[PDB]
């Protein structure tokens, strides 16, 4: 087997973005393989894909991953 | 078997986005493989796929993954 | 097996971006390999993909990963 | 097996970007290899991808990684 | 096996960029190899990719890495 | 086996450069080698890729690395 865990505790801003382009296909996070036995795809934290996407102060949480 | 867990505890903003392209397709997070025996896709945290989607202050939780 | 974990605790700004370009495909973070036995894809913290994407004060959390 | 972890504790801006270029695809962080047995891909901290991306005071957390 | 970790504690501005150039593809940080057994990709701290990208006071956090 | 770690504590600006030149592809930090068994890619601190990119007072945290 394999193990992982996390927790959070706590005890105690303007931004301008105008987008402009005529074309672009976009992929966030990816991998590919033919003839491949153990394709394992793992993702955590904060992630998004968009022709525009913006990351103000985005992560206050915590985390981890493991495999194989 | 295989193991993970978490939970969250606690003891105690302007942004502009204008979209512009007419259409051009987007896929957020994915992976591909022909001829694959141990085909595993695993996902956590905060995720969306959309032509625009935005990540203001998004993650307060916690989490983790394992497989094989 | 493999093990990982993390936590957060706590005890105690203007920016201009105007985009302009005529075309661009964009991929955030990616890798590729044919004929691969142990294809492992892992990501943490904060990452986002867009023809524009901006990272004000983005990470207040903490984290780590391991595999194989 | 392999182990990693981290934590944050705490006890106690004017910038302009004008974008202008006519074309240029962008990729953030990436690597590639054919015939490759143990492709292992890992990332953390704060990283983002676009034709322009700006990193104001962006990292206030902590972390690390290990594999193989 | 292998180990890594880090932490942060704490106890206690104008700049101009106008971009102008006619074309440029840009890649943040990358490496490549055919015929490779132990392809390992690791990144930390703060890094971002753009045809223009600017780093005011970007790191207050801390970190390290190790592998294989 | 292998080990690494670090930490930070604490207890106790005008500049003009406007960009103009006609073309440039730019890569931040990279290396390549075919027929290479132990391709190991590790990076820290802050570095950013852009045809013009400016680093006022950018890294005030700390770190170091080793692998294999």
Describe this structure in words.
6 copies of one chain form a homohexamer. With 68 residues, chain A is an all-beta fold. The termini of chain A are close together. Chains in contact: A-B, A-C, A-D, B-C, C-D, C-E, D-E, D-F, E-F. Chains A and C meet through strand 1, strand 2, strand 3, strand 4 and strand 5 of A and strand 1, strand 2, strand 3, strand 4 and strand 5 of C. Strand 1 of chain A pairs parallel with strand 1 of chain C, so a sheet runs across the interface. Chains A, B, C, D, E, F: It comes from Homo sapiens (Human). Chains A, B, C, D, E, F: It is found in: Cytoplasm; Membrane; Nucleus; Synapse. Chains A, B, C, D, E, F: Belongs to the synuclein family.
Task: Itemize the secondary structure elements and their pairings.
Six copies of one chain form a homohexamer.
Chain A: E1 3-8, E2 16-18, E3 26-32, E4 40-43, E5 46-49, E6 62-65
């Amino acid at each position: 087997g394999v193990v992982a865990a996390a927790e959070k505790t706590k005890q105690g801003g303007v931004l301008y973005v105008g987008s402009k382009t005529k074309e672009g296909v976009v992929h966030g996070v990816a991998t590919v393989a033919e003839k491949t036995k153990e394709q394992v795809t793992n993702v955590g934290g904060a992630v998004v894909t968009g022709v525009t996407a913006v990351a103000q102060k985005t992560v206050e949480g915590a985390g981890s991953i493991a495999a194989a």
